[PDB]
């Protein structure tokens, strides 16, 4: 009569690494590393993302004609740009503090596009029909949907001075532009002034602009430039524009809402009818594992990104069915 | 093994024992069979559960973390940001892999210790009433029925009950 003491064994082929010995076959184990995604752009906690599609932040905010017009009011959980972003700044120039603006939009949860300066009846005694071939829409010459090219009317450019009082109850992003003609001839032909100036002021913003005339290399067949500026108008505050030339006046501004957990990503995937708590540019992650090796860029509630190819923790015993 | 039981003096494992990590195999006149030890198995399960759950618990939920952009005159800030992301990534990869390795070693050692202690428990319950025939087995000097085997397993082995008979057979 005998009795024996022994331990469990099975057919498991799971392997783990230890400090003394790599590659140990064990009876039970647990994977801590998430390597699977669905390859889709999904909703984040029920909220659909803001896809810009063919355009980037600059093109979307400025109002590039080639972009498919978005609904007046939008709300999202994160913003998606495509690598195929061709449509942005269509008329050559510098976008001042564009990166900072992107960083500001990174915490924005929704926008309301509204008319801050109504076209017909805002800039009397001035032309508002100016277009360009650099911003071509459907073959013809056009211009930004949110901006307005103020030009001389009937041989004169009177010193205009308009204002707007923010009663939206939220931050109002206002964008405008300053034109820099290649020669003084065009300067006189457009704004009828050689000593023109633009003045934009709020309670905390204050800037003056002076046209710089010089011949420049052709960019999109344009020797002239156009610098773009922006500011965030506080609730209850007033913004004042005063110009006697070279002002690309605002027409549509943005009522912005602040949120948490948002961000801007560059993705190739397309939007599907799914929902997730974690999103990467490669796809969505549905997991409770602490680690993931899919992508460093994550939005929502995700596992920690690591370079590891394998993170398997042994729970069972050394498997010896021999 | 650090305790020399698993893959040690108990060379192999039992596929025949499917209801537990550690246990027994018996053979008497009534027949033979396996029987997992529920106490030690449950304790080990609890401990390792606590280990896994603590490893998972220590890693907090990674909230939204996206890249940032810089113009042509901000190369320093760009490289600084990159250095931050890279450094954190290195450190976390390191920590994860190392922690997994360490806890794996400790886990195998833990199982080894459990088996060893079980064997020593049985060896201490029995005495000169049985002999060690190696491979983690004991051969009785007396007749041990299913009730006797059960007394061995649930820790109530009556040594003086069989001491006389075992003394006679041991001679």
């Amino acid at each position: 009569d005998t009795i024996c003491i022994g331990y469990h064994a099975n057919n498991s082929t799971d392997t783990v690494d230890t400090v003394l010995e790599k590659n140990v076959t064990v009876t039970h184990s647990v994977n801590l590393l998430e390597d699977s995604h669905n390859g889709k752009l999904c909703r984040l906690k029920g909220i659909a993302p803001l896809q810009l599609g063919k355009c980037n932040i600059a093109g979307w905010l400025l109002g590039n004609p080639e972009c498919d017009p978005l609904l007046p009011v939008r709300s999202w959980s994160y913003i998606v740009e495509t690598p195929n972003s061709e449509n942005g700044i269509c008329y050559p120039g510098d976008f001042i503090d564009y990166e900072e603006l992107r960083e500001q939009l990174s915490s924005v949860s929704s926008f309301e596009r509204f008319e801050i300066f109504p076209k017909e009846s805002s800039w009397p005694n001035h032309n508002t029909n100016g277009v360009t071939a650099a911003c071509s829409h459907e073959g013809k010459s056009s211009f930004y949907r949110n901006l307005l090219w103020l030009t001389e009317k009937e041989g004169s450019y009177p010193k205009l001075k308009n204002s707007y009082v923010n009663k939206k109850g939220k931050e109002v992003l206002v964008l405008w532009g300053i034109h820099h003609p290649p020669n003084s001839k065009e300067q006189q032909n457009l704004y009828q002034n050689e000593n023109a100036y633009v003045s934009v002021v709020t309670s905390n913003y204050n800037r003056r602009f002076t046209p710089e005339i010089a011949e420049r290399p052709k960019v999109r067949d344009q020797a002239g430039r156009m610098n773009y500026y922006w500011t965030l108008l506080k609730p209850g505050d007033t913004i004042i524009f005063e110009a006697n030339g070279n002002l690309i006046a605002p027409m549509y501004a943005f009522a912005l809402s602040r949120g948490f957990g948002s961000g801007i990503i560059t993705s190739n995937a397309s939007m599907h009818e799914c929902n997730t708590k974690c999103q990467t540019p490669l796809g969505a992650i549905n997991s409770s594992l602490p680690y993931q090796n899919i992508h460093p860029v994550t939005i929502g509630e995700c596992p920690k990104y690591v370079r590891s190819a394998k993170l398997r923790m042994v729970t069972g015993l050394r498997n010896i069915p021999s | 093994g650090l305790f020399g039981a698993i893959a040690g003096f108990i060379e192999g494992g039992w596929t025949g024992m499917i209801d537990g990590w550690y246990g027994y195999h018996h053979q008497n006149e009534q027949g033979s069979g396996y029987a997992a030890d529920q106490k030690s198995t449950q304790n080990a399960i609890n401990g390792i559960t606590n280990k896994v759950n603590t490893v998972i618990e220590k890693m907090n939920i990674q909230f939204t973390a996206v890249g940032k952009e810089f113009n042509k005159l901000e190369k320093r800030m760009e490289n600084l940001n990159k250095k931050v992301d890279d450094g954190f990534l290195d450190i976390w990869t390191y920590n994860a892999e190392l922690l997994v390795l360490l806890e794996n070693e400790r886990t195998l050692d833990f199982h080894d210790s459990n088996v060893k202690n079980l064997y020593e428990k049985v060896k201490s319950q029995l005495k000169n009433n049985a002999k060690e025939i190696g491979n983690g087995c004991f051969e009785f000097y007396h007749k041990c029925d299913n009730e006797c085997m059960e007394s061995v397993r649930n820790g109530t082995y009556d040594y003086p009950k069989y001491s006389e008979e075992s003394k006679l057979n041991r001679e």
């Binding site: - | 198995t41 399960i45 390792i48 559960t49």
Partner: peptide, 11 residues
């Protein structure tokens, strides 16, 4: 996490 490896474990 729970390790339901045996039926009589208590989870």
């Amino acid at each position: 996490x729970a390790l339901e490896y045996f039926e009589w474990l208590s989870x």
